[PDB]
Design an enzyme around this catalytic site. Sequence first.
Site, PDB file in Angstrom:
ATOM      1  N   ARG B 152      40.151  69.937  13.128  1.00  0.00           N
ATOM      2  CA  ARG B 152      39.777  69.503  11.791  1.00  0.00           C
ATOM      3  C   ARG B 152      40.527  70.256  10.703  1.00  0.00           C
ATOM      4  O   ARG B 152      40.669  69.741   9.590  1.00  0.00           O
ATOM      5  CB  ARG B 152      38.267  69.641  11.602  1.00  0.00           C
ATOM      6  CG  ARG B 152      37.501  68.426  12.134  1.00  0.00           C
ATOM      7  CD  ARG B 152      36.088  68.793  12.575  1.00  0.00           C
ATOM      8  NE  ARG B 152      35.398  67.653  13.167  1.00  0.00           N
ATOM      9  CZ  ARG B 152      35.556  67.256  14.423  1.00  0.00           C
ATOM     10  NH1 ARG B 152      36.347  67.957  15.233  1.00  0.00           N
ATOM     11  NH2 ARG B 152      34.943  66.180  14.890  1.00  0.00           N
ATOM     12  N   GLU B 351      37.736  42.002  32.045  1.00  0.00           N
ATOM     13  CA  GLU B 351      38.927  41.378  31.480  1.00  0.00           C
ATOM     14  C   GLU B 351      38.956  39.882  31.755  1.00  0.00           C
ATOM     15  O   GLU B 351      39.378  39.099  30.898  1.00  0.00           O
ATOM     16  CB  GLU B 351      40.187  42.062  32.013  1.00  0.00           C
ATOM     17  CG  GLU B 351      40.278  43.550  31.661  1.00  0.00           C
ATOM     18  CD  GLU B 351      40.378  43.800  30.164  1.00  0.00           C
ATOM     19  OE1 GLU B 351      40.869  42.912  29.438  1.00  0.00           O
ATOM     20  OE2 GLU B 351      39.956  44.883  29.709  1.00  0.00           O
ATOM     21  N   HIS B 481      40.122  55.867  14.331  1.00  0.00           N
ATOM     22  CA  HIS B 481      39.842  54.640  13.589  1.00  0.00           C
ATOM     23  C   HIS B 481      39.856  54.855  12.083  1.00  0.00           C
ATOM     24  O   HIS B 481      40.172  53.927  11.325  1.00  0.00           O
ATOM     25  CB  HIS B 481      38.487  54.077  14.019  1.00  0.00           C
ATOM     26  CG  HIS B 481      38.422  53.712  15.467  1.00  0.00           C
ATOM     27  ND1 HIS B 481      38.445  54.654  16.472  1.00  0.00           N
ATOM     28  CD2 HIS B 481      38.329  52.508  16.079  1.00  0.00           C
ATOM     29  CE1 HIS B 481      38.376  54.046  17.643  1.00  0.00           C
ATOM     30  NE2 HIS B 481      38.303  52.743  17.433  1.00  0.00           N
TER      31      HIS B 481
HETATM   32 CL   LIG Z   1      33.293  65.378  12.252  1.00  0.00          CL
HETATM   33 ZN   LIG Z   2      37.246  44.151  26.363  1.00  0.00          ZN
END
Ligand SMILES: [Cl-]
Ligand SMILES: [Zn+2]
Lengths: 13, 590
Positions: B152, B351, B481
């Site tokens: 971090r 899948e 993300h």
């Molecule tokens: Cl965090």
């Molecule tokens: Zn998947």
Amino acid sequence: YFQRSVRLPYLRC
Amino acid sequence: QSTIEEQAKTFLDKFNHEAEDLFYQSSLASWNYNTNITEENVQNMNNAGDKWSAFLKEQSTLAQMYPLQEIQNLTVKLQLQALQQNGSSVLSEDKSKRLNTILNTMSTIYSTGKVCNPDNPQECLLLEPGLNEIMANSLDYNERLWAWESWRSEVGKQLRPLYEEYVVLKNEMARANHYEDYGDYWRGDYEVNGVDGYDYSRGQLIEDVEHTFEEIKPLYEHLHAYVRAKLMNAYPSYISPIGCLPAHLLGDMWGRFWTNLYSLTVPFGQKPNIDVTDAMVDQAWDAQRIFKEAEKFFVSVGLPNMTQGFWENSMLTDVCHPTAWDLGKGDFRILMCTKVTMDDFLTAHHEMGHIQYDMAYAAQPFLLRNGANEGFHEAVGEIMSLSAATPKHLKSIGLLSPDFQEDNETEINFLLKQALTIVGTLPFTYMLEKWRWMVFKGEIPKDQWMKKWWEMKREIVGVVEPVPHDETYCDPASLFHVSNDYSFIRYYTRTLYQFQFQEALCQAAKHEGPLHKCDISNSTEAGQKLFNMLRLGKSEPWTLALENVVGAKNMNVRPLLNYFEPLFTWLKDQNKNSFVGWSTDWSPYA
Ligand SMILES: [Cl-]
Ligand SMILES: [Zn+2]
Ligand SMILES: *[C@@H]1O[C@H](CO[C@@H]2O[C@@H](C)[C@@H](O)[C@@H](O)[C@@H]2O)[C@@H](O[C@@H]2O[C@H](CO)[C@@H](O)[C@H](O)[C@H]2NC(C)=O)[C@H](O)[C@H]1NC(C)=O
Ligand SMILES: *[C@@H]1O[C@H](CO)[C@@H](O[C@@H]2O[C@H](CO)[C@@H](O)[C@H](O)[C@H]2NC(C)=O)[C@H](O)[C@H]1NC(C)=O
Ligand SMILES: *[C@@H]1O[C@H](CO)[C@@H](O)[C@H](O)[C@H]1NC(C)=O
């Protein structure tokens, strides 16, 4: 990765 | 039926034919690189990406000629809606150049992130595999703390000034596309308008996520209290009996999943979990047999066989990331570096579920050949592996002894392992996206970003930072993300959907007993219920498509709670001499 999308047509491999 | 509408249909017909041709050619350049990684394939891939994205921008320009107000065909409206969105084109060339630079820099910082030994600067660890291995397997409080904090401070602190400018530019792009902010822009994936009885507003998503989270809080608090007691044995003197869990002791770099806490929390460790890998090798199973078994499973519920082109064009053995490919023109493929293991047996069912979804909506217009929303596709894949892993299914196909009986303690071990992954990630996913939504909304000032991040971690997640972090940190951006600009709430909605799907399919299959043992195999009524949604693609509102399977129009967490009810009952008894819940006051450093 290619996609059927107008917001994210290409995704990183 | 009007002149603009009729002209709109003609444009979409031309677009659909051209999109199918170019997307198929692009997809082949994608298949070739991902199967044969060479510079020649990299360059053709890079060329195909610019061709594909430039084509969509031109078609987006042509699509502006047909105003939506004069369109009455919803299927036409839906495709025009997708094509007409401007995206970052609303920004001046300077700002879009700046945003692309910031986006690429954040991604590069995350993926090149490395931390080095303080006493040996030439010895360094990347996230994968170095820091991830520590975060999963280390029982050393200070070694885990060093890994968690160094990541971090090396990566997150770099991202902090970039993330501030990323927020400003994304909000500018979103507002110019007639959204309140970037968070509102992301929530548009769930928006439904113009269908009476099925509409869904972008603000409604916030309400439903918060309401469903309230209903799961009792189960999570009991899971948290049980895990806390086991963690006090694993890390003596470092965890308060009334406090949050320290953020660096959760089994991965963020606590996104609690999966790696299983060996520290397993209720009955002398009973091993089911692993039919030995049975598969003893029966001389190979990759072809696995996918043949998966094909028979889908056939048994009424779904069609795999295409002959699937078998000839797929790569089922040794980019080994398991993927299902929908190239168009009847070409469906699976890429998997399959091994003879139970895990790859389950992933193969996952899948092929994607492929079954793809084959069901293949006749829809090009842009409507997609999951009903961002959560549907992975929910469909998950429920396939749920059925395949049950002892009832493994006994049917002869990988488990016919005399097998799952007992009290093996069932509890399985449900706890499932809960550490499935339930543990729900407060994490909700709290992270809520922070982004509030930041995009402008409700969290920059000088309080990390103060509110850890206030929300403590209150919502029951997790506390092991060391104080001022506003030079950007802890959210230390997750892939966030730094790579991907929405996160899909992991929350997908999770609720998959148990809604499974419960409906199992009721159609007349399953007797607890949900977690259900197998939908040989149930053509279940496949019919499922196929009724699979065929729709994106041509109907996701509220309608969800109703086709489960009989309800909205996200609902009761099926998930039903799935974990045997664990919830056991946890309540386990926790009857422990505190349930946490105080946000305690911290490791105070
Ligand atoms: Cl965090
Ligand atoms: Zn998947
Ligand atoms: C999308 O933006 C256009 C204008 O942006 C230009 O056209 C895009 C397709 C894209 O190629 C950009 O890079 C271009 O710079 C909007 O068109 C305007 O619409 C208003 C309607 O109120 C009209 O008064 C203006 O004259 C139009 N301007 C132009 C140049 O045509 C369009 O409405 C946007 N679409 C959506 C869905 O928001
Ligand atoms: C919207 O337009 C599509 C065509 O682009 C319509 O779908 C066609 O409907 C006619 C009449 O029922 C059928 O004969 C065709 O087979 C359908 N498909 C195609 C590709 O033409 C659709 O019905 C229209 N929407 C509404 C609500 O009428
Ligand atoms: C489905 O039924 C067939 C015969 O009707 C049987 O051979 C097969 O084992 C069954 N499959 C499952 C998964 O129960």
